[PDB]
């Protein structure tokens, strides 16, 4: 099933040859997301075969807006557990915790995120991501993400799960 | 609803203003209005039609719906007002103002409505240099700006900062920059709020916000943020320009746009989470979850406002850092001290902040909490909250256009104080989303046209510059003309970019 609502437009991060070489030696990340129309910012639209994958693709969509995540090497693994009062706040806090992993402490960016579990009875989540510290000498500059917003946030938990999140840039 | 069924709530009040009537969205306490002339009108109605076109999934809320949703917040007085830069945001519309009666016990404060870039602002600097002095060294100057000012994601401040320095900057604002020698006393005098909000409490700023803000203090940011060398092209009000130090067409100015960075983003994020928790206790009905709010006197409301003020002091410290680095770059290129170059602050004015202000509502003076999202103060002549040098001209207004068109300086008016609670805009606003700009524009076409215009550019990612192209924003002249013809701001100066750095 085609879940993209737009034709594919891949953002170009002006890769150096060394960065192109770093990306060339790892398996390509499967991308199930797209950046949609929002007048002031950008709407993340991500999907998967499970709700877990729809969440992890949204996180990868968020990190894919900051840089070319294909240039990120899997040198370290980081855990993100969070909870909410419903799927929307679980999604909000899931993306917010990952944004915080990137924005403080160890300044970590994953090349891939995997959601290991979503407790839908208590709205809890376990996820991991592998990558390295973000470095301007190693990774290209995309767009900085300011925050996660609830604007027009949509979580669909049926046969082909998908989410829509507007993030502040 | 169908597009035609939506228009039944829309009336043109006058040549430059539209009315959004009650019932457009549920539970509107007051009507909505937005100020647009002929050119800006189509962009606003096309957003209503095309934001959620289909009957399925996806889409976003157009700005008219967000203006109406804001009109449903408890305690709002007069109107939910969209300023000429209005377009869809994430809670409030961008360019959306709302004031709340602080003596109404149901009045709320909306941190998700104020915005995540708390106290983001525009600072205009002047020089005694002319364009003829800069053109021989234009590309060198743009590079010097790029080398001095860190921009883009992952950037960190060049001057080392520790936690105590951040704690003092949260409390003192520009007073910290003055104490450490990064600012001049004249900068504070011509800065809004004198560059410091006294009720800021660093204890209301989370450890997470401080951990995010510490490396990013001294960085410009990304997105709409810019540092731009400009040239005066036209002086509509010589008296106001003379008070601002602008003497002649051809004079070089520098316009800087930056905010509270990750600290302010986290402060807003932390507050929104607290409001959601508080709404389980006191259940306030809001049409949009981003508008999660609490009563102003609530512990959540008071804690947010005190942390918001600290984030505002952070933004003033950051813009002082941008000014200090701008002065260093000009000094290196021209081998002249910044004082000898007259690199003084004309004004610093902010958006994305809530302020306690005195306003007359239906003949009675009232104390209001004025939310301004993507919109700024435009205080009239003889206002007590305006520096002495602008008591007679009115408050300076800074409207940045794009890196390839124009920017304007205006002055607040008495009619703006009456109609919009002294609110105007900070820029043109977007006409195309970033995603739609990619489909319509090519990065090489944008770079080449800017070079053909003699504009020097240094950006963090040149192959994404189409998302920030001049064609992506409204015509700034139409926005400025709407403010002028509506009487909510008065044209003073027209500026033209010659060099811009962006992240
Ligand atoms: P607010 O919603 O923060 O938007 C800021 C405002 O600034 C203007 N803008 C965007 N890029 C530039 C630039 O390179 N130079 C100038 N002078 N102004 C710029 C837009 O109008 C935007 O709406
Ligand atoms: Mn934004
Ligand atoms: Mn801004």
Author numbering:
A (entry chain B): 11 to 179
B (entry chain A): 3 to 505
Provide passages from the article that reported this PDB entry.
RNA ligases of the RTCB-type play an essential role in tRNA splicing, the unfolded protein response and RNA repair. RTCB is the catalytic subunit of the pentameric human tRNA ligase complex. RNA ligation by the tRNA ligase complex requires GTP-dependent activation of RTCB. This active site guanylylation reaction relies on the activation factor Archease.
To obtain a structure of the RTCB-Archease complex in the post-activation state (i.e., with the activated RTCB-GMP intermediate), we co-crystallized RTCB with Archease in the presence of the nucleotide co-factor GTP, and Mn2+ ions. The nucleoside part of the covalently bound GMP (indicated as GMP*) adopts a conformation similar to the pre-activation structure with GMPCPP. Our structures confirm the previously identified residues involved in base and sugar binding. The Mn2+(C) site is occupied and coordinated octahedrally as in the GMPCPP structure. We assigned density to a single phosphate group at the axial position, corresponding to the γ-phosphate in the GMPCPP structure. In addition to metal coordination, the phosphate molecule is bound by RTCB residues D119, N354 and K375, and Archease residues K156 and D178.
